[PDB]
Coordinates of C-alpha atoms and ligand atoms in Angstrom, one line a residue:
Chain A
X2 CA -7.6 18.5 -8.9
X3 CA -7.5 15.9 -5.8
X4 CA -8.1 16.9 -2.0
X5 CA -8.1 15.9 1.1
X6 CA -9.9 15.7 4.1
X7 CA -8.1 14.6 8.0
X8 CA -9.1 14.5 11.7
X9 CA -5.9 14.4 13.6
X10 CA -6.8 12.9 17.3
X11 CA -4.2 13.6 20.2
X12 CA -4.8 12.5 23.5
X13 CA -2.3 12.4 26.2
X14 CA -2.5 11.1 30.0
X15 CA -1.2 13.2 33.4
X16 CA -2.0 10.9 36.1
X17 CA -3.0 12.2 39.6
X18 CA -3.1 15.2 37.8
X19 CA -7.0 14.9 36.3
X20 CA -8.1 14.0 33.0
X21 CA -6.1 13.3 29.5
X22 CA -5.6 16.2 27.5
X23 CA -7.5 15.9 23.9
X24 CA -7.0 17.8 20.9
X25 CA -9.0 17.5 18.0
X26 CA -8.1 19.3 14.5
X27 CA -9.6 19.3 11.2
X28 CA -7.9 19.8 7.6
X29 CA -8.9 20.4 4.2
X30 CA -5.8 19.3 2.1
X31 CA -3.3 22.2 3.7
X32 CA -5.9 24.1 5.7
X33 CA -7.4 23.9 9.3
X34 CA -10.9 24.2 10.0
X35 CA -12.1 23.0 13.3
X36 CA -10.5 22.6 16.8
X37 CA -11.5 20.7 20.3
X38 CA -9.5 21.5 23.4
X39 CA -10.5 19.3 26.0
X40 CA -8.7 22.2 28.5
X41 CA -10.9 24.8 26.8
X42 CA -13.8 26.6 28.8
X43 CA -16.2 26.4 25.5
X44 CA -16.6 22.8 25.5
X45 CA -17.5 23.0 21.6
X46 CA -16.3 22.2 18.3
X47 CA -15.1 25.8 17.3
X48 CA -14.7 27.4 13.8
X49 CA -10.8 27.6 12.6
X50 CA -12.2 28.8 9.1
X51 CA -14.2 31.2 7.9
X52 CA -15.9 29.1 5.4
X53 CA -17.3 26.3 7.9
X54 CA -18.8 29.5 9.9
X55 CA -22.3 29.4 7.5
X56 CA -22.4 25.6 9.0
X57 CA -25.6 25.8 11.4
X58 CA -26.4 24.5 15.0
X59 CA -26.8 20.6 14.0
X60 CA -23.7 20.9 12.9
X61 CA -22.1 22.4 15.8
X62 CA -24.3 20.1 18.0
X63 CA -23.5 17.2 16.4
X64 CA -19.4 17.6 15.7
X65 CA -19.3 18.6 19.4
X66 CA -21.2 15.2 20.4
X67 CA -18.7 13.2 18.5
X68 CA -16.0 14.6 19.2
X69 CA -16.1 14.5 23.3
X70 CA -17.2 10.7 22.2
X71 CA -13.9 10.1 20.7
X72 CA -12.4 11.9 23.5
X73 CA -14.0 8.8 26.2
X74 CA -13.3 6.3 24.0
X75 CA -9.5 7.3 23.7
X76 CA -9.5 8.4 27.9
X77 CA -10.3 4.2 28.2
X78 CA -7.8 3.6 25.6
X79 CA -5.4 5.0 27.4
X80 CA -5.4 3.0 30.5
X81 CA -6.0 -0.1 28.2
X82 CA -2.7 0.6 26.4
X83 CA -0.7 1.4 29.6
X84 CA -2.2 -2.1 30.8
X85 CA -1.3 -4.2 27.7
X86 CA 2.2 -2.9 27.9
X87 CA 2.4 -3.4 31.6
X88 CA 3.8 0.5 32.2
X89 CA 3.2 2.7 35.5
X90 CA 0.3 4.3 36.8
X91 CA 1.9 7.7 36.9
X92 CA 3.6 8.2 33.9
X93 CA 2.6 10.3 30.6
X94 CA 1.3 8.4 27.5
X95 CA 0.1 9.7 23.9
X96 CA -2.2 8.1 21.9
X97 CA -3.1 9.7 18.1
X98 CA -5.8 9.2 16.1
X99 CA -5.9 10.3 12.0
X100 CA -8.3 9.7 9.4
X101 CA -10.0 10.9 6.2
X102 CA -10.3 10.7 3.0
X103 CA -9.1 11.5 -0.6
X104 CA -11.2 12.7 -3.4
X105 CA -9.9 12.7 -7.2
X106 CA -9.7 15.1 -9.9
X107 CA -13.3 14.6 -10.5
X108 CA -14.1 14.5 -6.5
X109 CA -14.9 10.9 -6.5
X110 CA -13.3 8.6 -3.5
X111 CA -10.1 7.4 -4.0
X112 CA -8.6 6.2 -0.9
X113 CA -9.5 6.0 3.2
X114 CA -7.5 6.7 5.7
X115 CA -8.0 5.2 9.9
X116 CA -4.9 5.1 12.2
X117 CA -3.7 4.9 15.5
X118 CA -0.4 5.4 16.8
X119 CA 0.5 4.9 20.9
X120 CA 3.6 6.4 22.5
X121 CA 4.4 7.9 18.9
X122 CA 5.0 4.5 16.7
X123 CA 2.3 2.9 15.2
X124 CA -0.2 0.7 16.7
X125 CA -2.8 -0.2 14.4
X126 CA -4.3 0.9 11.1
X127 CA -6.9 0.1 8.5
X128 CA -5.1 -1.2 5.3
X129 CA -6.0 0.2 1.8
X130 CA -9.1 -2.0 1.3
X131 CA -10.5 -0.7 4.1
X132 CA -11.6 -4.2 5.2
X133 CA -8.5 -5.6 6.9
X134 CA -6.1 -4.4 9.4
X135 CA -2.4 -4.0 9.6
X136 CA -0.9 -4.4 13.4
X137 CA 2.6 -4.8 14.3
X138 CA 3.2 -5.3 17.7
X139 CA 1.4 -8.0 20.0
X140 CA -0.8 -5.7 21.7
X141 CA -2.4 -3.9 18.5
X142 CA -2.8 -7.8 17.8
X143 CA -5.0 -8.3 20.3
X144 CA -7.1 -5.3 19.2
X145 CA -7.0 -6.5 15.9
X146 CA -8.7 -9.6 16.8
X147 CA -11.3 -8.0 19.0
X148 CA -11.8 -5.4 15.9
X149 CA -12.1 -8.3 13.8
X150 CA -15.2 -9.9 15.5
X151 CA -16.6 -6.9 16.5
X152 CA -16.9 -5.9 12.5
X153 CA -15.6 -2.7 13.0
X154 CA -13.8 -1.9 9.7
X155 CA -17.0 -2.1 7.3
X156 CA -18.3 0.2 9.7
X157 CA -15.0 2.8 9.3
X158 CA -15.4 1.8 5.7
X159 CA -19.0 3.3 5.2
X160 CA -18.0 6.8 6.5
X161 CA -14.9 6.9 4.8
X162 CA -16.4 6.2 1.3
X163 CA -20.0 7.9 2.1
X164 CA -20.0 10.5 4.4
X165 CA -16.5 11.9 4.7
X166 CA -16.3 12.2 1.2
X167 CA -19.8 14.2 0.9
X168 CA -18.6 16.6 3.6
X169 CA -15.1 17.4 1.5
X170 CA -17.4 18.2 -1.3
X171 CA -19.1 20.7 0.5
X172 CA -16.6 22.2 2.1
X173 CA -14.6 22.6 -1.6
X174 CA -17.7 24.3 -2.6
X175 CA -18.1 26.7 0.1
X176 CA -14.8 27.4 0.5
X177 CA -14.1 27.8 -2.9
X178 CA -12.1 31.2 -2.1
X179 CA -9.5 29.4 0.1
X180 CA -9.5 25.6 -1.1
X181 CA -9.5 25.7 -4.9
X182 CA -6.5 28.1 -5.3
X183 CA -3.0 27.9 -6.2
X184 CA -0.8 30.4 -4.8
X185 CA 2.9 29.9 -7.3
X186 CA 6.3 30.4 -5.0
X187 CA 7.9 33.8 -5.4
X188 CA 11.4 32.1 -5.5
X189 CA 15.1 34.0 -5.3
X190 CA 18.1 32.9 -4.5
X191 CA 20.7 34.7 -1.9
X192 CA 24.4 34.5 -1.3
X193 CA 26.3 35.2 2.0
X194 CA 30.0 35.0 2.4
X195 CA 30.9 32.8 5.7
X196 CA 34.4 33.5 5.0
X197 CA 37.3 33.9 1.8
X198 CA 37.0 30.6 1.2
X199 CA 32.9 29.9 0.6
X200 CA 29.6 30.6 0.5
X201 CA 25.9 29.6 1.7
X202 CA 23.8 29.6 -1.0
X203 CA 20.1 29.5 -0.5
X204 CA 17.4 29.1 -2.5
X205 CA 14.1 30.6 -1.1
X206 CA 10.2 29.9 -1.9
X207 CA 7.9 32.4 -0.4
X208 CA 3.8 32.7 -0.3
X209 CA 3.0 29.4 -1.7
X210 CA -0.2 26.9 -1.7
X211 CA -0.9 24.3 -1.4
X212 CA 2.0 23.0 0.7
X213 CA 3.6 20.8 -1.5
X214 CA 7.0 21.6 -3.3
X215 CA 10.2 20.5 -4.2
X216 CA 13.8 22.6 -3.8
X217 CA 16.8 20.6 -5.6
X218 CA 20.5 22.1 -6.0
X219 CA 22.3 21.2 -9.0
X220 CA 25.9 21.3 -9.6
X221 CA 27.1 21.6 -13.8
X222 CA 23.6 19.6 -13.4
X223 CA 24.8 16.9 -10.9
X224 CA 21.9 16.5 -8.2
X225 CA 23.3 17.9 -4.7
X226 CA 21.3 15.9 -2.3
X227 CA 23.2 15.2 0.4
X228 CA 25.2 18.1 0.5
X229 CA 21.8 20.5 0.4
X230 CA 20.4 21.8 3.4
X231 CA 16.8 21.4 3.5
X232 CA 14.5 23.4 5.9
X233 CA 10.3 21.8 6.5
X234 CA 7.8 23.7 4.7
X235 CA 6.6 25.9 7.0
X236 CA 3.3 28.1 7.6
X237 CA 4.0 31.9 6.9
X238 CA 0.6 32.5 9.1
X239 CA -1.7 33.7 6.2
X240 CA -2.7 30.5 4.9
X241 CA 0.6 30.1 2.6
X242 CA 3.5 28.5 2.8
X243 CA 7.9 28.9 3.4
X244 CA 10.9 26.8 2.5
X245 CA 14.4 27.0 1.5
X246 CA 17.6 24.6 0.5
X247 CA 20.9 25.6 1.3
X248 CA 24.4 24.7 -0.2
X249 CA 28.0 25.8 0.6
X250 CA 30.2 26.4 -1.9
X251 CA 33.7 27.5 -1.9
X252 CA 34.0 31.0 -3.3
X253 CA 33.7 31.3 -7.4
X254 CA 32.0 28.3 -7.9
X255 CA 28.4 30.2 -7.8
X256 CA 27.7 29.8 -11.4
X257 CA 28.1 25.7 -11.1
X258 CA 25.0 25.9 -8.8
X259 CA 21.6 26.1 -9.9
X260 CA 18.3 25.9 -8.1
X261 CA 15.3 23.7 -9.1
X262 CA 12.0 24.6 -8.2
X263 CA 9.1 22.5 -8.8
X264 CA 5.1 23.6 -7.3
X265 CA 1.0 23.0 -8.8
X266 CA 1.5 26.3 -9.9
X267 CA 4.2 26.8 -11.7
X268 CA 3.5 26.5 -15.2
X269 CA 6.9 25.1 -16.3
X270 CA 9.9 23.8 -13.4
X271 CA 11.6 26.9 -12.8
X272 CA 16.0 27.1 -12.7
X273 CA 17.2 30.0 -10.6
X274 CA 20.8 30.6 -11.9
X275 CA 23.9 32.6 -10.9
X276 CA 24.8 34.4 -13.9
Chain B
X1 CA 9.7 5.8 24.7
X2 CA 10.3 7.2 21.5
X3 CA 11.3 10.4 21.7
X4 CA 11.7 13.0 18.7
X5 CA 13.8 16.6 19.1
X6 CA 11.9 20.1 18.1
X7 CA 12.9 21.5 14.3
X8 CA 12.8 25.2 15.3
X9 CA 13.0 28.0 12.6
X10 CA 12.3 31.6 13.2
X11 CA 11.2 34.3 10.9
X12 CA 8.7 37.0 9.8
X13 CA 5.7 36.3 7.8
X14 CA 6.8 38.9 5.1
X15 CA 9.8 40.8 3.9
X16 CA 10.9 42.5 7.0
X17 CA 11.4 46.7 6.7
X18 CA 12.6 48.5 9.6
X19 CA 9.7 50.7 11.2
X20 CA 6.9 48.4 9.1
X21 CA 4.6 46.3 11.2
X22 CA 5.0 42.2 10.2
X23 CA 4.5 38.8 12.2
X24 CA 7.0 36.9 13.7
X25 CA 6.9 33.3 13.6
X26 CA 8.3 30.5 15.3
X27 CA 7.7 27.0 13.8
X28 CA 8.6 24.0 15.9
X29 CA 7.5 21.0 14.0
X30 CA 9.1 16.8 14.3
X31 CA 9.0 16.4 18.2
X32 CA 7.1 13.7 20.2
X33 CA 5.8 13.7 22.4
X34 CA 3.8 16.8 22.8
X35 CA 4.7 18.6 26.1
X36 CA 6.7 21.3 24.6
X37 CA 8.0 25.3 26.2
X38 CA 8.0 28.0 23.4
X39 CA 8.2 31.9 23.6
X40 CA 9.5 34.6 21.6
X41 CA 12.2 36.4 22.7
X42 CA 12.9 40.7 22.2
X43 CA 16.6 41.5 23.2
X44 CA 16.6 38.4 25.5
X45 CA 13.3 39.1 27.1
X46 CA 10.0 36.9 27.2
X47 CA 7.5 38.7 25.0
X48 CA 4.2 38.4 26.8
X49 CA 1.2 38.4 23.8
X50 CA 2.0 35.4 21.8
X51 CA -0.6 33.3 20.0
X52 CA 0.0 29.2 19.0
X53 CA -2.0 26.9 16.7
X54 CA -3.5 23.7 17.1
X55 CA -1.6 21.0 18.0
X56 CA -1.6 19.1 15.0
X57 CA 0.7 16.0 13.6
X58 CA 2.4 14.8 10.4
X59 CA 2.3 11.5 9.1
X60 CA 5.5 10.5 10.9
X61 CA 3.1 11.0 14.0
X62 CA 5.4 14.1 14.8
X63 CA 3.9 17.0 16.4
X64 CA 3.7 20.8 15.1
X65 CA 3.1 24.0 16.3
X66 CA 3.5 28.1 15.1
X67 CA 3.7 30.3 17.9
X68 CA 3.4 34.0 16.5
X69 CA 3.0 37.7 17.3
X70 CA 2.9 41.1 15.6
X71 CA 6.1 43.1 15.6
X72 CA 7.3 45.9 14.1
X73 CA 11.1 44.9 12.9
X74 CA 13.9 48.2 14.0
X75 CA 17.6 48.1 13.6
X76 CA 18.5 47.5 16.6
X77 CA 16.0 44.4 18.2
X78 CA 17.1 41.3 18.4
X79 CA 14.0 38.5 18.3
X80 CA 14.9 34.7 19.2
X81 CA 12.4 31.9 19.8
X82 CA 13.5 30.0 23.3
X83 CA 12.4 25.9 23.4
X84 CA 12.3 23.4 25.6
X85 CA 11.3 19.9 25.0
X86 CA 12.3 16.4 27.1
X87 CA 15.1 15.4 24.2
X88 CA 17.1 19.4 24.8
X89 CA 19.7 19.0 27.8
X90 CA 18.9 22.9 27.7
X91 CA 16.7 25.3 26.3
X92 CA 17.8 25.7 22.6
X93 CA 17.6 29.3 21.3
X94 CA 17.2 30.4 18.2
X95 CA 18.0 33.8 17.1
X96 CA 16.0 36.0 14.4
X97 CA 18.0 36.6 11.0
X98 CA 16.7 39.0 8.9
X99 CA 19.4 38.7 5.9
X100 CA 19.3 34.9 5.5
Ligands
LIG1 CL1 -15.1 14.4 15.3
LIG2 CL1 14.6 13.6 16.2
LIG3 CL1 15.8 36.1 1.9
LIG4 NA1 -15.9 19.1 12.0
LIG5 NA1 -7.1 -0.1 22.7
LIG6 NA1 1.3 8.4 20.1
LIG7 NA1 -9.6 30.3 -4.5
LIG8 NA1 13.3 28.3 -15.7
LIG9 NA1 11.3 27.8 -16.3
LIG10 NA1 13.3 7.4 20.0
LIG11 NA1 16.7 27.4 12.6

């Protein structure tokens, strides 16, 4: 139904010892599509997927362009930052950088996406209406005011509701194969004896896509949250996804627990029992 | 300043089978900042060939990465994934475990 697209930005400084590194990554919903390494010999926006491959030269051209762009602007954001916080010369910083978009059932815009962090915490971001800003601290306040009279939101705003959007459209289409599947969870659940006295049970969810799930223990029905053990959804290395929930139980108690399994393409919530 | 500690798990891509060739995975995801010492590990040994993604982020701003490599899973290998980050005292080691 809805989709996704995201540029993840990461740049960090090493002082003395040259230039920031800056990593660029592209995503559609769960699934990469473009790097920049700013360490890399190639100097280009490179292919991550096979379906932005067909994309020709202007395109390569022209991603590359912008991207080493963003690359200077965040290399003099850098030393900005490290000023308006008043830290060393010679110590390591990180600034980040996401945005994108969000398409519908239908694939018509539904939400933007433009946000900086610094040093791993927020620093400034565009708010929902894509006109204003939200800043906490006093230096992002700063940059919001200079942000503010420099008009740059409508123009964040144009490509967020224009051309981002038109891109994810294309890329659903062409990758088609890879985007616009489900991939259900082969689920089980095991049991290991720790000692005479209890058990790990785990409930497991293999080859799945898109990314998003939910794993819930249940106990004669009673939700187990804080006693569950839950692992982040993690990439198997083909394009699907991993995760599991553990409980331990004493001993005899097996049949009490049931999992809970919930994924886009299940067709009904699924209950893994001991029985 | 902030500073957030690795999430490491380590596993095969598929079902392992003893003597049938599979992917081994290490998945380090919900550590800032970025500067971060990963390798898989055969009997306590570095392995030499292994690949990594992109360094890429979650919405928490918390960085992610998969380092992998082809193996063919026997009886009696042991495989670990070996970290190191600013927020481990030591390198944490993780050991590969097939039955889980
Ligand atoms: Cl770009
Ligand atoms: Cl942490
Ligand atoms: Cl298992
Ligand atoms: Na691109
Ligand atoms: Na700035
Ligand atoms: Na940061
Ligand atoms: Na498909
Ligand atoms: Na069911
Ligand atoms: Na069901
Ligand atoms: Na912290
Ligand atoms: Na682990």
């Amino acid at each position: 139904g809805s989709h996704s697209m995201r540029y993840f930005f990461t740049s960090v400084s090493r002082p003395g010892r040259g230039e920031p590194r800056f990593i660029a990554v592209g995503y559609v919903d769960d699934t990469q599509f473009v790097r920049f390494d700013s360490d890399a010999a190639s100097q280009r926006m490179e292919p991550r997927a096979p379906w932005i491959e067909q994309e020709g030269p202007e395109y390569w051209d022209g991603e590359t362009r912008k991207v080493k762009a963003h690359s200077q602007t965040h290399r003099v954001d850098l030393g900005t930052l490290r000023g308006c916080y008043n830290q060393s010369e010679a110590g390591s910083h990180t600034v980040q950088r996401m945005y994108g978009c969000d398409v519908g059932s239908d694939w018509r815009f539904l939400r933007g996406y433009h946000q900086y962090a610094y040093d791993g915490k927020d620093y400034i971001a565009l708010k929902e209406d894509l006109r204003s800003w939200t800043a906490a601290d006093m230096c992002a306040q700063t940059t919001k005011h200079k942000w503010e009279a420099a008009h740059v939101a409508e123009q964040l705003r144009a490509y967020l509701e224009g051309t981002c959007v038109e891109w994810l459209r294309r890329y659903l289409e062409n990758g088609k194969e890879t985007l616009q599947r489900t991939d259900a969870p082969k689920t089980h659940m095991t049991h290991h004896a720790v000692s005479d006295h209890e058990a790990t049970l785990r409930c497991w969810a293999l080859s799945f896509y898109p990314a998003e799930i939910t794993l819930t223990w249940q106990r004669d029905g009673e939700d187990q949250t804080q006693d569950t053990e839950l692992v982040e959804t993690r990439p198997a290395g083909d394009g699907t996804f991993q995760k599991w929930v553990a409980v331990v139980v004493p001993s005899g108690q097996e049949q009490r627990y049931t999992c809970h399994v919930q994924h886009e393409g299940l067709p009904k919530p699924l209950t893994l029992r001991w029985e | 300043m902030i500073q957030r500690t690795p999430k490491i798990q380590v596993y095969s891509r598929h079902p392992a089978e003893n003597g049938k060739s599979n992917f081994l995975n290490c998945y380090v995801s919900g550590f800032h900042p970025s500067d971060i010492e990963v390798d898989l590990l055969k009997n306590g040994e570095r392995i030499e060939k292994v690949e990594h993604s992109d360094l890429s982020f979650s919405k928490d701003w918390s960085f992610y990465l998969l380092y992998y490599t082809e193996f063919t899973p026997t009886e009696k290998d042991e495989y670990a994934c070996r970290v190191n980050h600013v927020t481990l005292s030591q390198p944490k080691i993780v050991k590969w475990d097939r039955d889980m």
